[PDB]
Design an enzyme around this catalytic site. Structure first.
Site, PDB file in Angstrom:
ATOM      1  N   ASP A  29       0.707  -1.258   0.130  1.00 48.79           N
ATOM      2  CA  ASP A  29       0.177  -0.112   0.083  1.00 48.79           C
ATOM      3  C   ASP A  29       0.959   1.140   0.104  1.00 48.79           C
ATOM      4  O   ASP A  29       1.388   1.722   1.116  1.00 48.79           O
ATOM      5  CB  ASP A  29      -0.753   0.158   1.218  1.00 48.79           C
ATOM      6  CG  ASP A  29      -1.722   1.117   1.264  1.00 48.79           C
ATOM      7  OD1 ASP A  29      -2.006   2.000   0.300  1.00 48.79           O
ATOM      8  OD2 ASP A  29      -2.465   1.241   2.178  1.00 48.79           O
ATOM      9  N   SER A  73      -0.736  15.503 -12.249  1.00 48.92           N
ATOM     10  CA  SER A  73      -0.850  15.251 -13.400  1.00 48.92           C
ATOM     11  C   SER A  73      -1.091  16.593 -14.141  1.00 48.92           C
ATOM     12  O   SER A  73      -1.604  17.333 -13.604  1.00 48.92           O
ATOM     13  CB  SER A  73      -1.993  14.203 -13.458  1.00 48.92           C
ATOM     14  OG  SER A  73      -2.392  14.056 -14.957  1.00 48.92           O
TER      15      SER A  73
END
Ligand code: NA
EC number: 3.4.23.22
Length: 330
Positions: A35, A199
């Site tokens: 994770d 992004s």
């Protein structure tokens, strides 16, 4: 040093991925959910409330000659989906894919929430976010990666998740055979303890790319892609009969649909998520309503590049003095 371990989807939907991990002496192999969204290595154990264990393999520290109670240390963690676990702490030898750490904190669960009990395939979590998020009190503990870092040939790990298939976690090296073209690296902020990056934009299907900054985290322990409500509405608008369902808890679409691809920017590079990656199948057995793999982040307070996004790429988690992420097509 280096390590290389295969990671395997737990079910036909890629809801999560499990990776075998050797704990203790002799080795006790547990299947852990790696994770990059959290920083605790915790396991089902011989200390876990017996009513909360339903088929998981357990770690038994009394059977390990290298286990030592970390006296007075406790842990308690809450995840984004409302699940939780807590307990006490041992140090022990931990190996992933041939890479060995001595003195790793292994958080032994006394209590786990219903979602963990009901998932027999997941024996615990191995956190790979920054060690500033580790929950051990009163002495915060380091991640497996942070403990291994100085011994690794390169201070990196990579995630290469499969679509309906096994993939790979590598530590201490880049496999130049695992990706196509070049790796584009992008800046990371550690300020919230995550692999947080920005992004450069998105496209839906064959549509024009929209240049826009989307801050989010690279999170291997989240199934789906959670993005701002504007971006998610633009995506589902291109699927006939798609809608957001308050009763189901997100976007659903007709199982008869063909989904478009979704593209996200990494600097000047582009990663394309094939439409099929976005199908999470019927909402209930036999339903003709299917659950979408791209969902709104509104309410969560952060955008999350979960497995739907990461499994379309080869992803480098660069833990150098200035951390960065790298994405390549594959
Ligand atoms: Na679900």
């Amino acid at each position: 040093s280096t390590g290389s371990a295969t990671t395997t989807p737990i079910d036909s939907l890629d809801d999560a991925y499990i990776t075998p991990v050797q704990i203790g002496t002799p080795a006790q192999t547990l299947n852990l959910d790696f994770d990059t969204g959290s920083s605790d290595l915790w396991v089902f154990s011989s200390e876990t409330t017996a009513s909360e264990v339903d088929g998981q393999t357990i770690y038994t520290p009394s059977k390990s000659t290298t286990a030592k109670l970390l006296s007075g240390a406790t842990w308690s963690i809450s995840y984004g989906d409302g699940s939780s676990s807590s307990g006490d702490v041992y140090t022990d030898t931990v190996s992933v894919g041939g890479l060995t750490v001595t003195g790793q904190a292994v958080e032994s669960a006394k209590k786990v929430s219903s979602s963990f009990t009901e998932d027999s395939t997941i024996d615990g979590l191995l956190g790979l976010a920054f060690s500033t998020l580790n929950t051990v009190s009163p002495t915060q503990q380091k991640t497996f990666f942070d403990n291994a870092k100085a011994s690794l040939d390169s201070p990196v790990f990579t995630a290469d998740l499969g679509y309906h298939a096994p993939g790979t976690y590598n530590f201490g090296f880049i496999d130049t055979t695992a990706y196509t073209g070049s790796i584009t690296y992008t800046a990371v902020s550690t300020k919230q303890g995550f692999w947080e990056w920005t992004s450069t934009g998105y496209a839906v299907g064959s549509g024009t790319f929209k240049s826009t900054s989307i801050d989010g985290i690279a999170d291997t322990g989240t199934t789906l892609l959670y993005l701002p409500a504007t971006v998610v509405s633009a995506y589902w608008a291109q699927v006939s009969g798609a809608k957001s369902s308050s009763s189901v808890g997100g976007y659903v679409f007709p199982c008869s649909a063909t989904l478009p691809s979704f593209t996200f920017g990494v600097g000047s590079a582009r990663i394309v998520i094939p439409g099929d990656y976005i199908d999470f199948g019927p909402i209930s057995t036999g339903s003709s309503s299917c659950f979408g793999g791209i969902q709104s982040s509104a309410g969560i307070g952060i955008n999350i590049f979960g497995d739907v996004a990461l499994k379309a790429a080869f992803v480098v988690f660069n833990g150098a003095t200035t951390p960065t992420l790298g994405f390549a097509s594959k």
